[PDB]
A paper describes a structure:
To determine the structural basis of neutralization and synergy behind glycan cap antibody-based enhancement of base-region-binding antibodies, we solved eight structures of glycan cap antibodies in complex with mucin deleted (ΔMuc) [name] GP (Makona) and BDBV GPΔMuc. Antibody contacts are focused on the β17 strand of GP1 from residues 268–280, with the majority of contacts centered around W275, which, when mutated to alanine, abrogates binding.
The extent to which contacts are made within this pocket correlates positively with antibody-induced trimer instability as well as synergy with base antibodies. For example, [name]-548, [name]-437, and [name]-442 utilize W108H3, F109H3, and F113H3, respectively, to fully fill this pocket. For example, BDB-329 and [name]-237 only bind and neutralize BDBV and [name], respectively, whereas [name]-293 and [name]-442, for example, bind and neutralize viruses outside of their autologous virus. However, BDBV-293 and [name]-442 have much smaller footprints. Exposure of the RBS on GPCL was measured by the level of binding of the fluorescently labeled RBS-specific mAb MR78, which does not bind uncleaved [name] GP The epitope of glycan cap antibodies is being removed by cleavage, and in a separate assay, we confirmed that none of tested antibodies, except [name]-442, compete with MR78 on Jurkat-[name] GPCL. [name]-442 partially competed with MR78, suggesting incomplete removal of its epitope by thermolysin, which may have a minor effect on quantification of cleavage inhibition by this antibody.
Residue numbers in the entry:
A (entry chain F), E (entry chain E), H (entry chain D): 503 to 521, 528 to 598
B (entry chain C), F (entry chain B), I (entry chain A): 32 to 187, 215 to 280
C (entry chain I), G (entry chain H), K (entry chain G): 1 to 136
D (entry chain L), J (entry chain K), L (entry chain J): 1 to 107
The structure:
């Protein structure tokens, strides 16, 4: 149901994320080193579909943020999990 | 009313709110993901002269942020240090917890002055400034960021320096800094690689200021 | 290659005011990517006296003044018209002098890459000087 | 303030003889901020030398500056008839500018 | 089950809340303008019952806040949604 | 242990914790609402002389806040700027994110001095000070607020200025400010409308100080 | 309409101390909504000398002192008793003088609305003066 | 399933926690006085088992904190309640 | 991936993530509890000389905290005020909301100087510093804390002062402060009770400095 | 400090003649902060004028003040027998108060 | 019971430098839990002159200098070797003097508990003095 | 700075007679920061007294200090032959140290 209407699309993603004594903050890596990395290609149209999704979700997200008072919002996905459950078992 | 993408073994669908899909099983919260994507992946121009025309200043609107769990490597990140003509700062200091974007290829650091009409610099298309794992509606002073957008879904550097004058207005000018006294006029037709190549031939050949004056270069039009 | 020529002088009465101008060419534009510009005066029989200078915009666009003209003379520029101006107020007959514009410029080395100019903290280029007479 | 005073007020030498003119500043200054100028009636002063010891272009090698602190000199190794001009000192002071009073060189 | 025991009651509510390029913070309204407005009357005793409810919930809320360490609490209602679900499907 | 109201097609009920009501369906989190109501709707006196007797100072207790999603328009909001006799401040600056109450009819701004025994000013009845969309246990300096309470449930300005002396104690005095040198003694029998009417007749008729002294008016007792 | 009358004077020995008082009426109370009050002294054969003044509470309730009495004299008030006091310590015979209380007050314009008074930064009302003698 | 492998164990717990006009912050107790107290003994091995649990959960907690950006995390248990529900009624 | 303990009428079990236990009923969120336990309950040495060897400094790593709902009384809490040799501070001021641990028997307050290599002091074993109801990865200046760990599960002072030199290094020295000019050399064999007994006999008997010099005591080796 | 000095020390004029008395302040002061007082033996000084040019009430129009900066004057257009009093200056200085020394007016 | 003895003196030429030392015993160690240590000099025929002193580490380990030796002499210590040093640079013949080390120490009262020493802000213990001659 | 000056430069008294020596400081100082020292040829100075009035140990009771402000004295109640030494003042100043010039005591 996603139609990518952008002038162009980078078909691939080069991504980063955050996933003995290494676990101890004192001995572990500095912040620049806590990230992992890798590539994904446009398998079955997923990457360009994803770029279009992010372009469409932007309006809803900005209106949401206008309404709230939290200086930093970390709870959008927790709310989604709760609504998911209420819709099925309310 | 924020849409979620759903990843299937077919394609990416957008979850509804009115239609309940009984097979769209969610087994844990670890299947939910916030992803920060860069605007450069859509073909937006990234040269400094064009990039800054997408930003502007406003007052009466507070800044806000959201988090990411994952995101893209950027080819082009920006870092601004802009002052008013009277020497005061235009951009606010970044608050605790805001750190620069972790994965940039070229950082375009722009230092300079210009009119700064508002309290904060905001993105004109509504895109977010991407900081380490936080998207923000505003630009923080001295912090490296990428421009981008955020998706939500169910899963199953070389540092190039520029000087600027008139930073916050429509008619502005930029220089590429080779040395403290050596500059090259900047144009929208230059790529980051081009600038690095010019920095190597100029610096290596000694075509730099020797006197106390500023030596300003102009690229041959061809 | 840089040249600047003064105008707007002649006879003015003390207690009045006038604005001098100096328009040039041969540079890369006098507002940005360019040397700031100064005024210097020399009364006949006297040596040169610094009045003040307007910095280029890339260097902040401010004016540094000589003590003898503070709170009386203003140095300013018509951006992108390559023209320097001096506004002299509260004129006294002591201000009779030849008024010169002066520039810290000139061409630098070239390369297969492009062309270049230097912008200095001293003067290489002097104009002809416009005589300003202040008298009763 | 930082003020330039020249001495001697007049130099007197036959062409072909060596000539020197000194300036004393009221304040110490680094070499890179000094200059001398050459003036003849009807002309704006020529740059000659800047940065104490760096020659301006279009200037003969016989003109050479030197000095440090508060004491600077312009030496002409052989003064030619065409060089009997009025000479001035100048200093940049990293901001305010100062000119000397003007010294005459005569045969 | 709510008995309004207040000296008096304003029977009606005059309320405010927060619900093309307008969505973009740069072009949208200043904070004083992001609110909507309207009136409600005391339909079936609802408004005076509501005022009494707010008067009764105050004690529980203040004790709650004494116990917690968050400087700002935005999560009371998320906790309620979770307890609702646990009581029915625990 | 915070009660929720439940809105039915009958009336407003209070949800239990021991009794599960199978028909009290909750379909989404958007049906949950936090509502800020004003105390003035219960008939509490709102004149400045009586209002300030409900507030006081204490130390050893930290401030805390909660949010609102919706709330009432206030007829009477307050804004305090109170200093100690030695010139130092009594109230803390508001922290980032705290803004004044958005919908006030009359704002009663009180400036002055008095003893300030504690660290923070707290409400004596346990009511909250209502800021934009945040209720607080304390008063912040210079910020407009309403007094009120917060309900939780399942759903299906003219600026009047006063001077004060002895602000934090039991025996205090207030003046209504017409001009820098013109004041009217304040009484508990005056309404906001009354004060505005006095400001118009006094100001319009020129019955204001002309000399450098302060002209202090006293209302006829009748 | 405002009047204030001094008392508490007479003979005191040098090296000692005394407290003068001045009680008035005709105003609106002397603590709040009122002019602050000063002490002034005049030795026979001399002009008036400012001692200091206590501000009203609405104006902060502080005391501004004249240099000649600093660290010796204190100006204070008995709030709501309409009484001004002067505490003079470390007395010297140089302090023999007539001590006056003085007020920046008087009635202002009325209106159908109510009554009014003005409070000034100068003196309209003087008391009679109480003589204080400091001697061995 | 918990084997306490510590050199020694304090078998008992001396604990504290936070549970008319007293509810009003103005009249209520100062922060040092808002805590309750009591003792528990090692009934059926619970206390030493609990000390070992806290020693084992530490590694997971530190890695978690490394990954997140919240300056203060108050939401670990809310996430647990949500996952509990999703695993049973997903 | 953080384990939960489950309390049964049998014993304490660790909840799985792969195995769902149908009888492990959770009726409300009030059955979930965060508990802060002290390290002293595991027999770790608590004397100042040994305690400080478990702490150290690092840069490049930000501090973070988590909350407690309940926790243990501590026999031994610590409070540090450490400066660099140039007089500047080593530890950051505690931020709003951080308060000292509420239930300590003896507080060991250590004041002094030493090299402070990093930005923050971190625990070397990965334990947390326990503040009122918040565990932290770092030490805050002037705030009393206990060392400990945090468990998650399903439920159904005397102030002793010391001086320190070389605080942040391996070879350091400490003194027990009796008075401004009276000190006792500190040893690892001394218990808090021992130090209190020495403070009473020395102070009570007057064996303290009378002159302006410092009187330094050394305990008989036996 | 800001100190008031009167001149002349004594004025001498027949009643019906014009009289002026000036004060010079050690510091410049705005008009709104000045006053003059009239004293007779047995009486506290009367206000007369304040704010340099604003008359006190109960005072005849023949009394008029003027001045600026450091120089202020009281002019009596016609001095009457009843006006031969000792006159003083006063200034408020926006905080400290100063009195003049006292000038006698005689027939 | 405390003693410290100077060495490292003798003849040095002006324009040069030397380092004196003073090693002691009888204390509790001179680095921590101890008095700081000073140098004092006395030219023959002259009274004593303060040079400066190194504080103990528990007191910060810094050096307080006398004006006459500022920017020329340095007072430092070899920690745990109980040795005090004086580095004298830019020597002039005016520096010929007997150089002494001095300590604010000595034993204090004992108790059944343990032993004790006092560390002072004045000198109880003087060394013998090492003569330093500066000459051409 | 805070500088010590002794007077008289020389004391002259038969043994068994009382002797006093005073020092005047250029700056006022508290009692706890003062000391005097006793020197004989071949010896480093002995402490004698510290803190203005507190005796050093190993010192006879005949030696007693006193003073305040800028003026301090050492009194020897009876000067013995063994006490005819050079005496010096010293002050701690809470940081810089100062010595007096040295006063000779002779029979
Ligand atoms: C999601 O994806 C869509 C599709 O790609 C994006 O749509 C883009 O929207 C922006 C506007 O927000 C378009 O940008 C330009 O808008 C100009 C109009 O605004 C000007 O004038 C107003 C005052 O009237 C000013 O306030 C404003 O600042 C501007 O100065 C047009 O005039 C532009 O067209 C001209 O310039 C471009 C330069 O590239 C030329 O190519 C054109 O031919 C023309 O000369 C321009 O339209 C942008 O073009 C839209 N993209 C596309 C592909 O059409 C969304 O923005 C995106 N959302 C997010 C969050 O990323
Ligand atoms: C929820 O709804 C209920 C019902 O409306 C409200 O109940 C009110 O509670 C307050 C107290 O919290 C009552 O206010 C007054 O309390 C005074 C007692 O306290 C005084 O003395 C103590 C020291 O002993 C001081 O610490 C304190 O600050 C006070 O100085 C009474 O003496 C008052 O009565 C007198 O004054 C009133 C003035 O209006 C007169 O009408 C009385 O006749 C009498 O002379 C007074 O009782 C208040 O009255 C209660 N309301 C009602 C209707 O009874 C809750 O407060 C409300 N909760 C929230 C959060 O809004
Ligand atoms: C959960 O429970 C377990 C079991 O009790 C605890 O395990 C402890 O882990 C610590 C290490 O994190 C052990 O402490 C000591 O480690 C030293 C090695 O590190 C040194 O050298 C490196 C550089 O190579 C430095 O970076 C580091 O800072 C150290 O200087 C060993 O050398 C120590 O052994 C020696 O000293 C001890 C002193 O008590 C003697 O008893 C030993 O015989 C020997 O001489 C020491 O091993 C600690 O011992 C472990 N405990 C047990 C019982 O073995 C976890 O730490 C705990 N987790 C939490 C969060 O509390
Ligand atoms: C080593 O041993 C010594 C000797 O016992 C301990 O010294 C005592 O320390 C305690 C705690 O600080 C002191 O107790 C409190 O002192 C306060 C200050 O009083 C000063 O002024 C009075 C005169 O007005 C003097 O007598 C007194 O000595 C002080 O100079 C008092 O105000 C306190 O009383 C009030 O508060 C307490 C609660 O804290 C209430 O219970 C009381 O009722 C009252 O309201 C209190 O007395 C004690 O005075 C010190 N004694 C001596 C002789 O010095 C050292 O602390 C100890 N060190 C260690 C590490 O153990
Ligand atoms: C930047 O914006 C200004 C307006 O704020 C533009 O200035 C106007 O330009 C038009 C021509 O298009 C003239 O007719 C007006 O008289 C100008 N107004 C003023 C106040 O100068 C300016 O041209 C814009 N510059 C660029 C590069 O877009
Ligand atoms: C404000 O509180 C003070 C007490 O802090 C009250 O003062 C007391 O009043 C009683 C009469 O009710 C007198 O008997 C006491 O002697 C007074 N004590 C002091 C220290 O002055 C005061 O009356 C109260 N004022 C008001 C308006 O309530
Ligand atoms: C503290 O650490 C330092 C190193 O930073 C240790 O110093 C070294 O000690 C070894 C002996 O084990 C010597 O061979 C090296 O030459 C020393 N290096 C330096 C730079 O001094 C020091 O011994 C350690 N101290 C303690 C008490 O552990
Ligand atoms: C530029 O400035 C830096 C100091 O910030 C200096 O180290 C460097 O040598 C300078 N370069 C030139 C060409 O002056
Ligand atoms: C009151 O003060 C303001 C400055 O804050 C000034 O603009 C206004 O004229 C003043 N009014 C009077 C009556 O002095
Ligand atoms: C220690 O210092 C305090 C001031 O902080 C003072 O009150 C106390 O008397 C001092 N004790 C000694 C022995 O000097």
């Amino acid at each position: 149901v996603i139609v990518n209407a952008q002038p162009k699309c980078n078909p691939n993603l080069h991504y980063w994320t955050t996933q003995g004594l290494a676990w101890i903050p004192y001995f572990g890596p500095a912040a620049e080193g806590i990230y992992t990395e890798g590539l994904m290609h446009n398998q079955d149209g997923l990457i360009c579909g994803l770029r279009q999704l992010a372009n469409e979700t932007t309006q809803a997200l900005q209106l949401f943020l206008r309404a709230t008072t939290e200086l930093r919002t970390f709870s959008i996905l927790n709310r989604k999990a709760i609504d998911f459950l209420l819709q099925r078992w309310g | 009313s924020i849409p979620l993408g759903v990843i299937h073994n077919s394609t990416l669908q957008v979850s509804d709110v009115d239609k309940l899909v009984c097979r769209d099983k969610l087994s844990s919260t670890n299947q939910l993901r916030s992803v920060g994507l860069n605007l450069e992946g859509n073909g937006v121009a990234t040269d400094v002269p064009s990039v800054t025309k997408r930003w502007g200043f406003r007052s009466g609107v507070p800044p806000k942020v959201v988090n990411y769990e994952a995101g893209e490597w950027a080819e082009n990140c920006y870092n601004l240090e802009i002052k008013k003509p009277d020497g005061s700062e235009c951009l606010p200091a970044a608050p605790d917890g805001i750190r620069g974007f972790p994965r940039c290829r070229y950082v375009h650091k722009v230092s300079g002055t210009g009119p700064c009409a508002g309290d904060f610099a905001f993105h004109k298309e509504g895109a977010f400034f991407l900081y380490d794992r936080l998207a923000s509606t505003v630009i923080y002073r001295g912090t490296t960021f990428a421009e981008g957008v955020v998706a939500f879904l169910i899963l199953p550097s070389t540092t190039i320096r520029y000087q600027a004058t008139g930073f916050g207005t429509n008619e502005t000018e930029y220089l590429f800094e080779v040395d403290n006294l050596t500059y090259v006029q900047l144009e929208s037709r230059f790529t980051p690689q081009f600038l690095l190549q010019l920095n190597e031939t100029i610096y290596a050949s000694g075509k730099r200021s020797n006197t106390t004056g500023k030596l300003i270069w102009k690229v041959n039009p061809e | 290659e840089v040249q600047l020529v003064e105008s707007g002088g002649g006879l003015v009465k003390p207690g009045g005011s006038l604005r001098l101008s100096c328009t040039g060419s041969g540079g890369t534009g006098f507002t940005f990517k360019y040397a700031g510009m100064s005024w210097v005066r020399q009364a006949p029989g006297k040596g040169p006296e610094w009045i003040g200078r307007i910095k280029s915009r890339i260097d902040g666009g401010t004016t540094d003044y000589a003590a003898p003209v503070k709170d009386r003379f203003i140095v300013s520029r018509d951006d992108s018209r390559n023209t320097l101006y001096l506004q002299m107020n509260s004129l006294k007959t002591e201000d009779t002098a030849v008024y010169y514009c002066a520039t810290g410029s000139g061409k630098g080395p070239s390369a297969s890459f492009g062309e270049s100019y230097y912008y200095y903290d001293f003067i290489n280029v002097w104009g002809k000087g416009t005589t300003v007479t202040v008298s009763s | 303030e930082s003020v330039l005073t020249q001495s001697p007020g007049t130099l007197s030498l036959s062409p072909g003889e060596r000539a020197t003119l000194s300036c004393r500043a009221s304040q110490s200054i680094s070499r890179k901020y000094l200059a001398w100028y050459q003036q003849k009636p009807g002309q704006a002063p020529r740059l000659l030398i800047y940065g104490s010891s760096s020659r301006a272009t279009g200037i003969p090698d016989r003109f050479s500056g030197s000095g440090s602190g508060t004491d600077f000199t312009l030496t002409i190794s052989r003064l030619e008839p065409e060089d009997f001009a009025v000479y001035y000192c100048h200093q940049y002071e990293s901001s305010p500018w100062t000119f000397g009073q003007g010294t005459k060189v005569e045969i």
